């Protein structure tokens, strides 16, 4: 079953990330995924849990690379799933690989130091 609160993460495209990931002023963390790809599948509900939870500290968006292959190399992110932390519209950390619950709040927490 699925719902439209079941998420609290954001979608970009290459005519749409400027306006919302450059855009932020705030910590932004950008997936970089696709649905064909075993460990994006397994990374995506742990960055879900990840935006639902950590939405006061950071802002959590999608780039899917089976449809926006331009942004995926614009980046060099294209070794997928990769996640990058922008603060301020400027990237500040990348990750690449899958990642569980606390693997992910330890480098969130590096940015949110109440948890993990």
Do not use: Y
């Not at 932004?28 to 790809?37: H, M």
């Amino acid at each position: 079953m699925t719902d439209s609160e079941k998420s609290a993460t954001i979608k970009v495209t290459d005519a749409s990330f400027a306006t919302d990931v450059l855009s932020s002023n705030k910590p932004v963390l950008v997936d970089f995924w696709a649905t064909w790809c075993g460990p994006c599948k397994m990374v995506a509900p742990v960055l879900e849990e990840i935006a639902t939870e950590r939405a006061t500290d950071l802002t959590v968006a999608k780039l899917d690379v089976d449809t926006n292959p331009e942004t995926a190399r614009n980046f060099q992110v294209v070794s997928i799933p990769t996640l990058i932390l922008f603060k301020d519209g400027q990237p500040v950390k990348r990750i690449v690989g899958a990642k569980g619950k606390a693997a992910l709040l330890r480098e969130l927490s590096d940015v949110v130091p109440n948890l993990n």
